[PDB]
Design an enzyme around this catalytic site. Structure first.
Site, short mmCIF file in Angstrom:
data_model
loop_
_atom_site.label_atom_id
_atom_site.label_comp_id
_atom_site.label_asym_id
_atom_site.label_seq_id
_atom_site.Cartn_x
_atom_site.Cartn_y
_atom_site.Cartn_z
N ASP A 114 -16.61 39.08 3.60
CA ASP A 114 -16.36 37.88 4.37
C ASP A 114 -16.07 36.66 3.50
O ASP A 114 -17.00 36.07 2.94
CB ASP A 114 -17.57 37.61 5.28
CG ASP A 114 -17.40 36.39 6.16
OD1 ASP A 114 -18.41 35.88 6.66
OD2 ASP A 114 -16.25 35.95 6.37
N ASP A 121 -9.86 33.39 6.08
CA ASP A 121 -11.09 34.12 6.31
C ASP A 121 -10.90 35.57 6.75
O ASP A 121 -10.45 35.85 7.86
CB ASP A 121 -11.94 33.37 7.34
CG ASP A 121 -13.09 34.20 7.86
OD1 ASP A 121 -13.69 34.94 7.05
OD2 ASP A 121 -13.40 34.10 9.07
#
Length: 370
Positions: free
Chosen positions: A34, A220
């Site tokens: 992440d 992201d």
């Protein structure tokens, strides 16, 4: 780098994960990659959705930091004990470092029932790490304790099982085609960048560039689809529902509420518009652009597809949808993010995705939200 190739797995919609080992003896865990967060946290207790979990007690190298951590979300959260232990990435650089680990012992709306990952690897900066920026992120601890260059690259490939590659420490020319362009990392907290212009089928959306980065724009890998702010969103749909108006879809589809289907092999790709995002360049008044094809924002699930491009109100998020079309270079060492058409992109027999420049764009700074 070839050993690191194809080192990411996953299930469409639930992110990409990489295999890691923690403690002595090493314990194996699948960790979500992440780039949207900054904590290395793994489940360390028998939550029912977990296939396995970190067991501190059995690691002769574990070290309790006698400090807890709480990470709330809009509705969920995770909490646990802080500590450190020897970490490694089987299919990554042949090193091992002592990194901070958050042993999750209680969580809600965090883990996913069915998923094959047991923890998250936040690759962003300390500025957003919890409890505070004192908790050194994994990558930071890696670069320090070794000679692994301060940068990593991602090649998310989508498809249902998905695949990808996380080249740590370098760039693998085999994962991309064409030129590599760099946008600056505005601030080292999230991987923040600036969108200075957006086009649909080559036509500008005619909007103040500031509305593209309100209240910020980030890269992201931890988010599934492209997420634009309202104003940007509607405008983007208004143009797309109009670009492929040669058909009709319910108000649900354009909200991920429902989907559309067509006989296998016969999909009306051609009627769907490509999207162009113009990113701030490395030189003054200079920018470049990346274009996403329909494949990217129409995620599979005959053939059926859901509308990725969803609204947002937390700024632009360039999630998997975007990133899967490109090979993204997180050049941490030089505060910049590079893009290049991914070698694992799904294309039309007519159109093609690209990363082209340079373009002359004035006052790009004014696009940055404050």
């Amino acid at each position: 780098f070839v050993e690191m190739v194809d080192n990411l797995r996953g299930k469409s919609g639930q992110g990409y994960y990489v295999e890691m080992t923690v403690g002595s003896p090493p314990q194996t865990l699948n960790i979500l990659v992440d780039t949207g967060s900054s904590n290395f946290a793994v489940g360390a207790a028998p939550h029912p959705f977990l296939h396995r979990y970190y067991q501190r007690q059995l690691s002769s190298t574990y070290r309790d930091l006698r400090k807890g951590v709480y990470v709330p979300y809009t509705q969920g959260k995770w909490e646990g004990e802080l500590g450190t232990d020897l970490v490694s990435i089987p299919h990554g650089p042949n090193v091992t470092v002592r990194a901070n680990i958050a042993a999750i012992t209680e969580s809600d709306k965090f883990f996913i029932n069915g998923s094959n990952w047991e923890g998250i690897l936040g690759l962003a900066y300390a500025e957003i790490a919890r409890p505070d920026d004192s908790l050194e992120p994994f990558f930071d601890s890696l670069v320090k304790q070794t000679h692994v260059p301060n940068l990593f690259s991602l090649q998310l490939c989508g498809a249902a099982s998905v695949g990808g590659s996380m080249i740590i420490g370098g760039i693998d020319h085999s994962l991309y085609t064409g030129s590599l362009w760099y946008t600056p990392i505005r601030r080292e907290w999230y991987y923040e960048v600036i969108i200075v212009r957006v086009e649909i089928n080559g036509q500008d959306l005619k909007m103040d560039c500031k509305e593209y980065n309100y209240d910020k724009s980030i890269v992201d890998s931890g988010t599934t689809n492209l997420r634009l702010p309202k104003k940007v969103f509607e405008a983007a749909v208004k143009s797309i529902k109009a670009a492929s108006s040669t058909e009709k879809f319910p108000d649900g589809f354009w909200l991920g509420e429902q989907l559309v289907c067509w006989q296998a092999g016969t999909t009306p790709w051609n009627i769907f518009p490509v999207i162009s995002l113009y990113l701030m360049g490395e030189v003054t008044n200079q920018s470049f652009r990346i274009t996403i094809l329909p494949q990217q924002y129409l995620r599979p699930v005959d053939d059926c597809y859901k509308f990725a491009i969803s609204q947002s109100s937390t700024g632009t998020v360039m999630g998997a949808v975007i990133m899967e079309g490109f090979y993204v270079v997180f050049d941490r060492a030089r505060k910049r993010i590079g893009f290049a058409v991914s070698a694992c992109h799904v294309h039309d027999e007519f159109r093609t995705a690209a990363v082209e420049g340079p373009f002359v764009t004035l006052d790009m700074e004014d696009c940055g939200y404050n």
